[PDB]
Amino acid sequence: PQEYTLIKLKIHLIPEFLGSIVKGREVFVVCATLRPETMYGQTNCWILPDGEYDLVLAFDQVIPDGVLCKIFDKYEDTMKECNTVYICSERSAYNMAYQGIVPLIHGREQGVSDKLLPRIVSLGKVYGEQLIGTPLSAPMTPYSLIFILPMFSISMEKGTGIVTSVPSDSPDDYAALRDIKTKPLLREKYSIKDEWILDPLEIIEVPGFGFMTAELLCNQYKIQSQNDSAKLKQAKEEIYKKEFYEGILIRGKYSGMKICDAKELIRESLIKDGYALIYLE
C-alpha cells in the first residue's frame, strides 16, 4: 500500500482532436514513479499504444487513520474547483478520486434500482497511439519539451499506464528506447520522427559505473529487448538499491549530494511547486 510520486507532464500542444473536448483547460499526462531523483534525466514519456486512457477532470488544489474525498451532484458543480484534466487509466483515476485528487459526481446505477453510484468525470476515452508525438512540458529535465513515445512492456494494471523515461538510470527505459533507436521498421509503424528521440542525460554518478548505469546493467544481465521482463524486473530492483546508496547527483539544486540524502528534499519540492502529487496504490 505504497507512496508514489505522481508526476505531472503538461501537454504543450493540444492535438486538434482533443481541442473540442478540453476547452481551454490545462491537460497533463500523469505518471507514477518511485524515483523523483531521476526526473533530471527525462528524455521522453512512454505510453501503451493499444491502452485506453481517460481524460479525467481533476481538482486544481489538493489538501495533502485515513483519507477524504468529495462528491458533487452534477458535472456543472465541479467547474469551480476543477479546471484541470489528467490523462490516465480509468482504474487509476478511481484511485485518485478515493484520495481526493479528482472529483466524484452523483451517478445513478444501471437498471431497476435507485442506488447512488459515484463516478469520475471522464471527458472522453483515447488510445495511447493517438498521443504518440505529443509534446510535453516536463519538470526538472533540462531538455524541457519531451515527447510521447510507445513502450510495449507497460501494464495497464499499474500506476496510470503512462510512465517517465530516464534511460540513463532505468533499465526498462534504456531497453525501450534502444528498441526504438535500432528498429527502423518500428519507427515507421508509429510515424516516429527522429527529432522526438533525445539522448540519455548524465545525471547520476555511481562509483565504478559512471553516468550510464542502466546501459551497463542491461549489458551485464544480457538484456536484449524491452520484453525481457524477468531480467528487467530483477535489474530494476538492483539499480534502485545501488543508486539509492551509492548514487551521487550531478545535476540541479542538490548536485554533489548522495541520493539517499537528496531524495526526500527533491520529492518535497516537486509537491510544493506543483510539479507532482502524492499518490497511493
Numbering used by the authors: 255 to 318, 325 to 541
Show the paper's wording.
Despite predicted flexibility, the three insertions are, in fact, ordered and include well-defined secondary structure elements. Iax3 consists of a β-tongue structure which connects the α-helix (αae1) and the third β-sheet (βae3) of I2ae. Interestingly, Iax3 has a well-defined β-sheet in the apo-structure, whereas all the holo-structures show a significantly different conformation with shifts of up to 8.9 Å. Another difference between the apo- and holo-structures is the position of helices α1 and α2 adjacent to I4ae at the editing site, which needs to open (∼1.5 Å) to accommodate ligands. Overall, the CmLeuRS insertions are 25 to 45 Å distant from the editing site and thus are presumably not directly involved in posttransfer editing, although we cannot exclude this possibility in the context of the full-length protein and tRNA.
AARSs play an essential role in protein synthesis by charging tRNAs with their cognate amino acids. Similar to other LeuRSs, the C. muris LeuRS contains a predicted editing domain exhibiting highly conserved motifs that are important for the hydrolysis of tRNALeu mischarged with noncognate amino acids, such as isoleucine or norvaline, while excluding cognate Leu-tRNALeu. The structures show the typical seven-β-strand and three-α-helix fold of the LeuRS connective polypeptide domain (CP1), plus archaeon/eukaryote-specific insertions, denoted I1ae, I2ae, I3ae, and I4ae.
